[PDB]
Design a protein around this ligand. Structure first.
Ligand SMILES: N[C@H](CCC(=O)O)C(=O)O
Ligand SMILES: N[C@H](CCC(=O)O)C(=O)O
Lengths: 249, 247
């Protein structure tokens, strides 16, 4: 097929990478609203309007299916968007819950949800999880991880001090951690390392990657080479430059 | 005297606070583009457009003077705005340079400019400083300071470690530090302490507060009902003001 991938900026590249890795589609129209990014710190009303406007961007491209790669957008604007689209719009939250259900049998396993303040406050992960029968659910808005990852601070004392800042107030010891944000996969190993150490874990907690989850899901739902076209709200060449580092083979 | 104050979001309150205090105005229409903030990490073209669209917002409020409280906008779109503008537009850069000439005679004094990537990248401060004679100039895009302050990390090891991340590479020990960003005034005390405690400096480096600087300048040119506006939830924005303006 020919699809569109939407995100607030360059975070969506973590989804795009999984999409390319799988060779699921022949044409992908990537669009990042890099001029208004980030969404996670904004309000619900606003993100919803951004959502609608994103649809308008794809009207001329005529895609068969739109993937809302942004977790913040999937959480607060996927419904309204789907409500005005003729084509199917798949967010990243839904696929992750299927991913969890498929590999976590113990309904008591401690699950920690990570994401932006907007994502967390919408409680989209918690509701979908509870509905599926999970009883031990925690959530944390790790805002600073986004700007940190964007400055490319993927190691060192600043990241460690930042992770320590958000994690220390943690009560539960998670067996599952949801990277409910486009950025978090770039520091997934650092997060695993933090919990493995601070809790003398034998193995790292299971990490749920949004990109990998959507892919599996898309292969499932549509029993399934890769040519991308980049579009941005802000300087597009600036965005294309990021793809190089994020998508890194 | 009715004036509009423009900023990327809530950082502009630090200029507002310096304004209100001086009280030389009887009406201020504050407009923060909170839905698109920050400007500091974006490109010149986008920022120029944003600044232009900001004018389209004060047309109705019919203000006499427009203060661009944002250092990034000042650096990247002031010229463009002043061009298509009917009324005078004063940014926060030039006033900070006049305040520097006025307070620093040693044209060799080590000067460090701190601002967003865009502000630093534009060389607005280095250029203006050089046309005035200074030869000891250094600049640092201390990007993360904005999101940290936005999240109120104004103390603690996270802030401390961030300052260390940006400052340790610093070649010259600054005698003058320019808070070339609306958020930096909130960690001024902490920034002074850093170098002070890090080099046993009895006296803290001189810090230039953009807000104060534009006030002194506005004092010479000689020219309160504050009205908050925003591109994002106006509720969330004004709430913030309570803390920034808080005194
Ligand atoms: N794309 C957002 C992170 C960046 C932003 O806040 O816009 C998400 O996945 O939640
Ligand atoms: N107001 C901006 C900082 C925040 C932003 O980047 O929008 C400045 O003074 O540079």
């Amino acid at each position: 097929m020919k699809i569109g991938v939407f995100d607030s900026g360059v975070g969506g590249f973590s989804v795009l990478k999984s999409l390319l890795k799988a060779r699921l589609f022949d044409e992908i129209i990537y669009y990042g609203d890099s001029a208004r990014v980030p969404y996670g710190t904004k309000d619900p009303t606003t993100i919803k309007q951004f959502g609608l406007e994103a649809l308008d961007f794809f009207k001329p491209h005529e895609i068969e299916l739109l993937i809302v790669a942004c977790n913040t957008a999937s959480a607060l604007a996927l419904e309204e968007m789907q409500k005005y689209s003729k084509i199917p719009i798949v967010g990243v939250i839904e696929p992750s819950i299927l991913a969890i259900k498929r590999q976590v049998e113990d309904k008591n396993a401690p699950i920690l949800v990570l994401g932006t303040k907007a994502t967390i406050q919408s409680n989209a992960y918690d509701n979908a999880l509870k509905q599926q029968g999970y009883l031990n659910i925690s959530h944390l808005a790790t805002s600073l991880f986004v700007p940190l990852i964007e400055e490319s601070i993927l190691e060192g004392e600043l990241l460690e001090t930042c992770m320590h800042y958000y994690f220390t107030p943690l009560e539960i010891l998670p067996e599952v951690i949801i990277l409910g944000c486009t950025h978090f996969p770039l520091i997934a190993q650092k997060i695993e390392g933090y919990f493995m150490g601070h809790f003398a874990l034998p193995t790292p907690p299971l990490l749920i990657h949004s990109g990998d989850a959507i892919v599996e899901y898309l292969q499932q739902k549509y029993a399934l080479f890769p040519k991308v076209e980049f579009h941005a709200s802000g300087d597009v060449i600036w965005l294309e430059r990021q793809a190089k580092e994020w998508l890194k083979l």
